């Protein structure tokens, strides 16, 4: 693991790590964007086992961005693109991919629209925020959301922006947000319906190939968000996992490993 940083316009350090391809030279660079509903998480949240599969022949770069609610989604997008551009310049003549999980896959798809890359790996993400499941109360999160209060939640935030959880239970900010339907409010942008944040059909149509893995019974991001992408993009591969889970790869079970190996196959076809 090798550490770098990108210095933002506002003089904030965004760390990123590069893990090098095991068998050299690299076939490509995979820019990894972690999940956490834009509100919690950390860049180094991938199991070692997944990293070993991905980095056999690819470099894996784990990027960071400032989290909600201490910054807005406009700031997140700015951090992601500043980190992406710093990484892309370092791989000038080389295939490059975005790989996100959950909200990281959303960020990975924005990069795919606004930069020129060779493919996207979308694990249980989405291409838009202007959708009813994100606007309204989420059933799965509602009970826990109702068992905390706003002071409880405000004290899980940081007095200044962070790129990873500063307290173990920061994730309750996200449970609260989904469970009360305030997640769009906490994104804190002027107009969440704007095409900046919602990839248009004509834009989806021009995306590079997309690998999608999504559980049909996902309680956090409906599987329809993946079906929506498949309604427009020209090249897709879809693993539609028959589970009532969101992060089906939380543990490196055999089914999860198989999907990761399929990811590499998808990359190999592209870089051949």
Measured between alpha carbons, how far is residue 102 from residues 13, 119, 215, 255 in Å? Answer: 24, 17, 12, 18
Asked whether the beta carbons of 10 and 151 are under 8 A apart, the reply is: no
Indicate the helix (H) or strand (E) that contains 100.
strand 96-101
210 vs 231: CA distance, rounded Å:
12
Which residues sit directly before a break in the chain (C to N > 2.5 Å)?
Answer: none
201 vs 248: CA distance, rounded Å:
28
Is the peptide bond between 25 and the residue preceding it cis, with omega within 30 degrees of 0? yes
Lookup: tokens for 105: 């896959």
Asked whether the beta carbons of 173 and 69 are under 8 A apart, the reply is: yes
Q: Mind giving me the DSSP string for 187-209?
A: H--S-TTSGGGB--HHHHTT---
Q: Kindly report the number of other CB atoms within 10 A of residue 47's CB atom.
A: 15
Domains and CATH numbers, the chain: 1-272 (3.40.50.1820)
Closest to 8 in 3D by CA, of 68, 69, 77:
77
Q: Mind giving me the DSSP string for 4-43?
A: EEEE-TTS-EEEEEEE--SSSSPSEEEEEE--STTTS--T
Q: Mind giving me the DSSP string for 147-178?
A: HS-HHHHHTTS-SS--SS-SSGGGGHHHHHHH
59: left (phi over 0), alpha (psi -120 to 50) or beta: beta
Residues in Cβ contact with 35 at an 8 Å cutoff, skipping those fewer than 6 apart: 41, 45, 100, 101, 102, 103, 104, 105, 125, 247
DSSP category for residue 128: B
Lookup: tokens for 182: 């305030």
Rounded to a whole number, what is the distance in angstroms from the first to the last CA of the chain? 27
């Amino acid at each position: 693991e090798i550490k770098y940083k990108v210095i933002t316009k506002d003089a904030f350090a965004l760390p990123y790590t590069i893990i090098k391809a095991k068998n050299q030279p690299t076939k490509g660079v995979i820019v990894y964007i972690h999940g956490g509903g834009l509100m919690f998480g950390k860049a180094n949240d991938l199991s070692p086992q997944y990293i070993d599969i991905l980095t056999e022949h690819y470099d894996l770069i784990q990027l960071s961005y400032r989290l909600l609610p201490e910054v807005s989604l406009d700031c997140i997008i700015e951090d992601v693109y500043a980190s992406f551009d710093a990484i892309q310049s370092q791989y000038s003549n080389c295939p490059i991919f975005t790989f996100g999980r959950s909200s990281g896959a959303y960020l990975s798809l924005l990069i795919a629209r606004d930069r020129d890359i060779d493919g996207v790996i979308d694990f249980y993400g989405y291409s838009r925020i202007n959708t009813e499941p994100f606007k309204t109360t989420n059933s799965y999160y509602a009970k826990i959301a109702q068992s905390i209060n706003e002071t409880m939640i405000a004290q899980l935030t940081s007095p200044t922006p962070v790129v990873q959880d500063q307290i173990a239970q920061r994730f309750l900010i996200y449970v609260y947000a989904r469970g009360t339907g305030k997640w769009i409010n906490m994104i804190n942008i002027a107009d969440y319906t704007d095409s900046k944040y919602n990839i248009a059909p004509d834009e989806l149509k021009t995306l590079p190939p997309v690998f999608i893995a999504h559980c049909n019974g996902d309680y956090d991001v409906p599987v329809e968000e993946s079906e929506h992408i498949m309604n427009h993009v020209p090249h897709s591969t879809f693993e539609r996992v028959n589970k009532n889970e969101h992060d089906f790869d939380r543990r490196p079970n055999d089914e999860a490993i198989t999907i990761y190996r399929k990811v590499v196959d998808f990359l190999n076809a592209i870089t051949m």
